[PDB]
Amino acid sequence: GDWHCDTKWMGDHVITKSTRTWVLPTYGNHLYGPINFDGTTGSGANAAYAGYKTPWGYFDFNRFHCHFSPRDWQRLINNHTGIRPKGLKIKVFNVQVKEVTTQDSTKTIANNLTSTVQIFADENYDLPYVLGSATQGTFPPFPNDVFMLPQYAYCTLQGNSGKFVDRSAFYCLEYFPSQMLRTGNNFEFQFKFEEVPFHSGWAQSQSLDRLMNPLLDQYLIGDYGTDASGNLIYHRAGPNDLNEFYKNWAPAPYECIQNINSSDNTKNANSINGSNSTNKWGLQGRQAWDAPGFVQASTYEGAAAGQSLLNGVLTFDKSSATTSSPAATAVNRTIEDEIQGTNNFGNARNNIVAINQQTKGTNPTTGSTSQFETMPGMVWSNRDIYLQGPIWAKIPNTDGHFHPSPRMGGFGLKHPPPMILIKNTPVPADPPTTFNPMPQTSFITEYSTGQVTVEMLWEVQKESSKRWNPEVQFTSNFGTSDPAVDGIPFGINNLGTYVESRPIGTRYISKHL
Amino acid sequence: GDWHCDTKWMGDHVITKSTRTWVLPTYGNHLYGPINFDGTTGSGANAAYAGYKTPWGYFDFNRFHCHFSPRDWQRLINNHTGIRPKGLKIKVFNVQVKEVTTQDSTKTIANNLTSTVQIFADENYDLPYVLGSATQGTFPPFPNDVFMLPQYAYCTLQGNSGKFVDRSAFYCLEYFPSQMLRTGNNFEFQFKFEEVPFHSGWAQSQSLDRLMNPLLDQYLIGDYGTDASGNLIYHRAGPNDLNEFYKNWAPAPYECIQNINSSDNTKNANSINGSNSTNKWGLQGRQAWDAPGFVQASTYEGAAAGQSLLNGVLTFDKSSATTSSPAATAVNRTIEDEIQGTNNFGNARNNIVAINQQTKGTNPTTGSTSQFETMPGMVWSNRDIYLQGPIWAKIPNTDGHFHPSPRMGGFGLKHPPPMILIKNTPVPADPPTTFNPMPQTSFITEYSTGQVTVEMLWEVQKESSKRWNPEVQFTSNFGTSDPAVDGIPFGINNLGTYVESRPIGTRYISKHL
């Protein structure tokens, strides 16, 4: 049982290892409970839910900075055009259970060598899978930090006002087999990923309307209009008009999403209510935000500085925080312009279709559309992956799905890495000396802690490009930093806190279409 | 896991062993932090730095009295003309972790058998190497003393006012693999030194201008001058002038260093400002002391008593001390006169060169020089090694270096003994019973302690000299010592403190050139 936290680059694959220290409290006083919300004191009826919270807790490693340091991430993105996960192994070890006693003001903490902790992996996916929702409680990016394991809870099928119905499910986690760990015992688990395509780690150096040889003319003839008598006129497209070429392929579908400018406030309207202006989808008589949505270009070359989309991009914290309304200086806002070749700007809404039927006496009319959905012959790119973003998501179990790439990013999986759940075994306090049939509610106060190591095998694609001129690379560029106030970017500041200075995607090397 | 501390003399090699007891605190509250200094409150802009301090700590055995008792050192220097290191092995064992609780005034200390400590050697030289700077924190010379391990920190590349720049490096030490030690576990490491030349353990019994047979004349003819008409005059050198012999070899190069007299204050000027009078070299727009410098003779035979060089020699404490301005009676000041055969006196500045071009009508002129650097045909000796001095230094990793013998003394190495770093594994206190995403800052107060044994294999050269008369030997000479006040020299005094009475070099046996 030793420490690791290291990376090994072998050819076409790479292995990451990392070790952390976790702490597990007793949750819920060893009790289950039902939880609801009817919505009133909150947002409203769209916010209602019903479910259960459990005494158990769980591990979540599903972000990239869990497995990669910033320098390792740089080594990846400048030299490689693709990555996918292959295998996984987890080890929980060096477990300690501690008892807490409080007399008067003082508080003493003692070690208990015989008390245990329970752990199991859910290999058959029997529990509601709450990973892949991008919530808090993941391993910290900086290896020296100690973190709490979050409490496990789930939502089930609801009726009106967040009430249970006939199909609502209650799960007992003690009904699973688990193994019991003392000091000296360890838990191990291995997993193999299913086959998935490489994530595309390059930026597009062509656009989908320019794929032609610009010097030539087509052998296809286009319809230029009618003359004053109504005879059809023909025209051949060529170098003076490249936009009129007949083409084999069309760009990505869209639902129109509203623009927003993050840098410059003169471009925005005053007092926008974000919730009223976001895209939404309905289900069971209520509405939910559609965000980030299916990825669109958030900006393009020639657009104004700071151009973005309203709830169309991902935004991260610079450091772990609880704030409900963080300041603009505290966040990293992503920008996806690398897809601008196949993916239109999200607020453009500039596709045109014919809205009537023309005859002599009635002129043809057209209109722009806010909705243009999938048609045969369209191509598109997925959203990028980030050092701060999620790795995988579980594909819902359903009869049908279209292009099951998760919208926030990463790898869609039929069988994701299973949840690993853990809790302290309850230790009763002193019973009465007369028999009582009731369940015993008095327990010894305790918590546990240990180490966990995660090892991942990744497969990568090296970059072969034959362009003559140099390419854009990710580099560290800042003028100067004050060690008194600030410290080194991607480092520890003056207060001992780890700071992630800016967001980092994977798309730097370029390819033609 | 047993005690050793002993020496074994085998022929042409010798093995030293020693065992000590160490104590390791928690440093920095388990935090990294950036450190700078802009210079103002201190010396000034020449004093600025930028860097990081870490929660870790490390072992430093790099002084000779770590491995040799004074009697063993005597046995070495009277009988041997050379020594070099061969091999090394280190063992850390009998580790105890202790928890500290404070209630009201009293303080209780308890043992924790399951808590660990982390240790690794840096074999690939990935960390900044801070050994070889002759700082405090080495193993104590007397085997019964208990010592703290120092906190690890480093300097990185700086700009103005001690600010970080783009190439400044932050290192995470948890990113290294390390092994975790409980009570009952031990750490072992072995190392082999690269081939180096023997240190020269003899004093010179000849001088470089006297190498001739004094009875004879040369067959080479010298130029004695011109006559009144300007005709060249010739002269043959012989026993009446030995200084005028044509010679094959020249003495050592020098940068002139100022003299100082340590014994007699009538020789010194009043109110010398040492910092203004020392030799300095510039780098990156600031200046640093050049000390001790390239070794010169600090005194020679016939010079006044107490003659020395200003920051030209090494000076040690008699006992371990924190004093910033120690008294003259508290120090051991070294004297290097054993090199006076090949190495000129440091303040002499008596070499002479021609400063003009002579013709009829203009007389030849010469001048003395303060700077005379390396020329083909020069020979020199290195600085001596001392029982109190450093053993090795790391040669900087650079394209070029000239005669890479470290200036303070010892053995220059491309691959020195690697740093061994250690820290207490953080143990969190009781968490709250509601999940919080923040890192946990509350820890159990603890420290660790153990034993460490170091074993070194040395290679030595025995002395063959055929001179008829006896030689100078190092001996113990003092009239009497008061056991009430003082005790035995190189022993424990009345207060229980170990005292090193005088400095001891290696050069006693003599050889001709």
Place of tokens 């009763």: A428
Closest residue in B to A149 (Cα–Cα): B435
On chain B, the residues whose CB falls within 8 A of the CB of A322 are: 436-438
Strand partners, A199: A83
Place of tokens 């490009």: A465
Structure tokens at B370: 């303060």
Which of B93, B56, B174 has its CA nearest to residue B419?
B56
Q: Quick check: A111 and A413 in contact, CB under 8 A? A: no
The reply to whether residue A21 touches residue B426, judged by beta carbons under 8 angstroms, is yes
Which of A134, A126, A33 has its CA nearest to residue A419?
A126
Give the span between the Cα atoms of A115 and A427, in whole angstroms.
8
Place of tokens 């003493």: A108
SS3 per-residue string spanning A167-195: CCCCCCHHHCCCEEECCCCCEEEEEECCC
Q: Quick check: B458 and B15 in contact, CB under 8 A? A: yes
Q: Quick check: B428 and A449 in contact, CB under 8 A? A: yes
Q: Using alpha carbons only, how large is chain A's radius of gyration in Å?
A: 28
Question: What is the bridge-based pairing of β-strands A510-511 and A203-204?
Answer: parallel
Give the span between the Cα atoms of B348 and B371, in whole angstroms.
11
- Listed in sequence order, the residues at least 6 apart from A152 whose beta carbon sits closer than 8 Å to its beta carbon are A53, A54, A56, A57, A58, A130, A173, A421
- Listed in sequence order, the residues at least 6 apart from B229 whose beta carbon sits closer than 8 Å to its beta carbon are none
The reply to whether residue A148 touches residue B437, judged by beta carbons under 8 angstroms, is yes
The reply to whether residue A148 touches residue B440, judged by beta carbons under 8 angstroms, is yes
Which of B178, B51, B186 has its CA nearest to residue B122?
B178
> In a 3-state reduction of DSSP, which class is residue B38?
coil
CA of A338: how far to CAs of A231, A387, A388, in Å? 45, 16, 18
Q: Quick check: A52 and A158 in contact, CB under 8 A? A: no
The reply to whether residue B163 touches residue A481, judged by beta carbons under 8 angstroms, is yes
Considering only the beta carbons, identify the residue of A3, A25, A107 that sits closest to B180.
Answer: A3
How many helices (H) and strands (E) would you count in chain B? 2, 32
Q: Quick check: A461 and A17 in contact, CB under 8 A? A: no
Tell me the nearest-neighbour CA distance from B193 into chain A, angstroms. 28
Q: Residue A447: left (phi > 0), alpha (psi -120 to 50), or beta?
A: beta
On chain A, the residues whose CB falls within 8 A of the CB of B166 are: 476-478
The reply to whether residue B439 touches residue A145, judged by beta carbons under 8 angstroms, is yes
Q: Quick check: B353 and B369 in contact, CB under 8 A? A: yes
Structure tokens at A309: 């989309």
Closest residue in B to A476 (Cα–Cα): B166
Give the span between the Cα atoms of B390 and A81, in whole angstroms.
51
Place of tokens 């001596």: B384
CA of B195: how far to CAs of A488, B412, B417, B459, in Å? 40, 11, 14, 11
The reply to whether residue A113 touches residue B112, judged by beta carbons under 8 angstroms, is no
Closest residue in A to B179 (Cα–Cα): A2
Query: Which DSSP letter does residue B239 get?
Result: T
The reply to whether residue B430 touches residue A491, judged by beta carbons under 8 angstroms, is no
Structure tokens at A167: 């199909």
Give the span between the Cα atoms of B167 and B165, in whole angstroms.
6
Experimental method: cryo-EM
Q: Which of A488, A493, A498 to mutate to test the interface with B (most CBs of B within 10 A)?
A: A488
Closest residue in B to A110 (Cα–Cα): B112
The reply to whether residue A144 touches residue B30, judged by beta carbons under 8 angstroms, is yes
Peptide-bond breaks in chain A following residues (C–N over 2.5 A): none
Q: Nominal resolution in Å?
A: 2.1
On chain A, the residues whose CB falls within 8 A of the CB of B176 are: 5-6
On chain A, the residues whose CB falls within 8 A of the CB of B180 are: 1-3, 94
Q: What are phi and psi of A70, to 5 degrees?
A: -60, -35
- DSSP string spanning B240-267? TBSTT---S-B---EE---EEESS-TTS
The reply to whether residue A320 touches residue B177, judged by beta carbons under 8 angstroms, is no
Structure tokens at A230: 């109504």
CA of B160: how far to CAs of A295, B284, B293, in Å? 45, 10, 27
On chain B, the residues whose CB falls within 8 A of the CB of A58 are: none
Strand partners, B255: B371
Q: Quick check: B64 and B74 in contact, CB under 8 A? A: no
Closest residue in A to B36 (Cα–Cα): A483
Tell me the nearest-neighbour CA distance from A13 into chain B, angstroms. 20
Considering only the beta carbons, identify the residue of B118, B159, B428 that sits closest to A3.
Answer: B118
Q: Quick check: A204 and A338 in contact, CB under 8 A? A: yes
User: C-alpha dihedral over B203, B206, B207, B208, to 10 degrees?
Assistant: -110
B4 CB-side CA count, 13 A: 18
CA of A273: how far to CAs of A15, A44, A164, A276, A328, in Å? 46, 16, 33, 6, 17
- Listed in sequence order, the residues at least 6 apart from A118 whose beta carbon sits closer than 8 Å to its beta carbon are A178, A179, A180, A181, A422, A423, A424, A425
Q: Element (H or E) spanning B74, and its range? A: helix B70-79
Q: What are phi and psi of A30, to 5 degrees?
A: 65, 25
The reply to whether residue A2 touches residue B34, judged by beta carbons under 8 angstroms, is no
Structure tokens at A443: 């327990």
Question: What is the bridge-based pairing of β-strands B315-317 and B307-309?
Answer: unpaired
* Other CB atoms within 10 A of residue A307 CB: 22
- Listed in sequence order, the residues at least 6 apart from A124 whose beta carbon sits closer than 8 Å to its beta carbon are none
| Burial classification of residue B10, based on how many CB atoms lie within 10 Å of its CB (0-12 exposed, 13-18 middle, 19 or more buried) | exposed
Q: Quick check: A19 and B426 in contact, CB under 8 A? A: no
Query: Which DSSP letter does residue B450 get?
Result: E
The reply to whether residue A494 touches residue B34, judged by beta carbons under 8 angstroms, is yes
Considering only the beta carbons, identify the residue of B50, B427, B428 that sits closest to A483.
Answer: B50
Considering only the beta carbons, identify the residue of A21, A23, A480 that sits closest to B164.
Answer: A480
Instruction: Report chain B's terminal Cα–Cα distance, integer Å.
Output: 49
Q: Quick check: B292 and B314 in contact, CB under 8 A? A: yes
Considering only the beta carbons, identify the residue of B169, B175, B438 that sits closest to A320.
Answer: B438
CA of B292: how far to CAs of A382, A502, B311, in Å? 64, 47, 6
Q: Residue B303: left (phi > 0), alpha (psi -120 to 50), or beta?
A: beta
Structure tokens at B403: 């005669």
A327 CB-side CA count, 13 A: 2
Structure tokens at B170: 């932050």
Tell me the nearest-neighbour CA distance from A427 into chain B, angstroms. 17
The reply to whether residue A146 touches residue B439, judged by beta carbons under 8 angstroms, is yes
The reply to whether residue A5 touches residue B174, judged by beta carbons under 8 angstroms, is yes
Q: Quick check: B67 and B87 in contact, CB under 8 A? A: no
Place of tokens 């690791």: A4
Give the span between the Cα atoms of A89 and A130, in whole angstroms.
20
| Burial classification of residue B356, based on how many CB atoms lie within 10 Å of its CB (0-12 exposed, 13-18 middle, 19 or more buried) | exposed
Size of chain A, expressed as the number of residues it contains: 513
The reply to whether residue A490 touches residue B170, judged by beta carbons under 8 angstroms, is yes
Tell me the nearest-neighbour CA distance from A323 into chain B, angstroms. 11
Give the span between the Cα atoms of B48 and B162, in whole angstroms.
5
* Other CB atoms within 10 A of residue A119 CB: 22
Closest residue in B to A16 (Cα–Cα): B175
Structure tokens at B399: 């394209």
Task: Report the Cα A73 to chain-centroid distance in Å.
Answer: 17
Give the span between the Cα atoms of B32 and B55, in whole angstroms.
6
Cis amide bond preceding A292, omega within 30: yes
Which of B298, B292, B392, B390 has its CA nearest to residue B338?
B298
Size of chain B, expressed as the number of residues it contains: 513
Structure tokens at A476: 């560290």
Considering only the beta carbons, identify the residue of B178, B179, B428 that sits closest to A23.
Answer: B428
Place of tokens 């019991």: A180
Cis amide bond preceding B141, omega within 30: no
Give the span between the Cα atoms of B313 and B317, in whole angstroms.
14
Strand partners, A15: A8, A457
On chain B, the residues whose CB falls within 8 A of the CB of A113 are: 114
Q: Using alpha carbons only, how large is chain B's radius of gyration in Å?
A: 28
Q: Quick check: B194 and B9 in contact, CB under 8 A? A: no
Which of A115, A91, A105 has its CA nearest to residue A26?
A115
* Other CB atoms within 10 A of residue B369 CB: 15
Q: Element (H or E) spanning A79, and its range? A: helix A70-79
Amino acid in position B237: A
Task: Report the Cα A451 to chain-centroid distance in Å.
Answer: 26
Q: What are phi and psi of A29, to 5 degrees?
A: 55, 35
Cis amide bond preceding B292, omega within 30: yes
Q: Quick check: B295 and B407 in contact, CB under 8 A? A: yes
Query: Which DSSP letter does residue B238 get?
Result: B
Q: Quick check: B94 and B451 in contact, CB under 8 A? A: yes
Give the span between the Cα atoms of B255 and B291, in whole angstroms.
12
The reply to whether residue B163 touches residue A491, judged by beta carbons under 8 angstroms, is no
Amino acid in position A321: A
Q: What angle do CA B457, B458, B462 make, to 5 degrees?
A: 145
Give the span between the Cα atoms of A244 and A247, in whole angstroms.
9
Structure tokens at A171: 């799960």
- DSSP string spanning A360-382? TTB---EEE-SEE---TTB---P
Instruction: Report chain A's terminal Cα–Cα distance, integer Å.
Output: 49
CA of B474: how far to CAs of A218, B206, B471, in Å? 102, 21, 10
* Other CB atoms within 10 A of residue A238 CB: 14
Q: Quick check: A358 and A364 in contact, CB under 8 A? A: yes
Considering only the beta carbons, identify the residue of A6, A183, A491 that sits closest to B177.
Answer: A6
Q: What are phi and psi of B76, to 5 degrees?
A: -70, -55
Q: Quick check: A157 and A167 in contact, CB under 8 A? A: yes
Q: Quick check: A492 and B34 in contact, CB under 8 A? A: yes
* Interface A-B: count of C-beta contacts within 8 A: 142
Give the span between the Cα atoms of B68 and B22, in whole angstroms.
19
Structure tokens at A114: 């015989």
B370 CB-side CA count, 13 A: 4
- Listed in sequence order, the residues at least 6 apart from B201 whose beta carbon sits closer than 8 Å to its beta carbon are B77, B80, B81, B82, B83, B461, B506, B507, B509
> In a 3-state reduction of DSSP, which class is residue B300?
coil
* Other CB atoms within 10 A of residue B130 CB: 16
The reply to whether residue B32 touches residue A483, judged by beta carbons under 8 angstroms, is no
Closest residue in A to B434 (Cα–Cα): A27
Q: Which of B26, B433, B445, B446 to mutate to test the interface with A (most CBs of A within 10 A)?
A: B433
How many helices (H) and strands (E) would you count in chain A? 2, 32
Q: Element (H or E) spanning A440, and its range? A: none
- Listed in sequence order, the residues at least 6 apart from B213 whose beta carbon sits closer than 8 Å to its beta carbon are none
Beta strand extents in B43-123 (DSSP E only): 49-58, 80-103, 106-111, 117-121
On chain B, the residues whose CB falls within 8 A of the CB of A490 are: 170
Task: Report the Cα B42 to chain-centroid distance in Å.
Answer: 25
Give the span between the Cα atoms of A148 and A420, in whole angstroms.
15
Considering only the beta carbons, identify the residue of B103, B431, B437 that sits closest to A137.
Answer: B437
| Burial classification of residue B462, based on how many CB atoms lie within 10 Å of its CB (0-12 exposed, 13-18 middle, 19 or more buried) | exposed
Which of A492, A71, A226 has its CA nearest to residue B32?
A492
CA of A298: how far to CAs of A305, A327, A340, B327, in Å? 11, 21, 9, 72
Q: Quick check: A348 and A370 in contact, CB under 8 A? A: no
Which of B267, B337, B266 has its CA nearest to residue B299?
B337
B3 CB-side CA count, 13 A: 5
Query: Which DSSP letter does residue B438 get?
Result: S
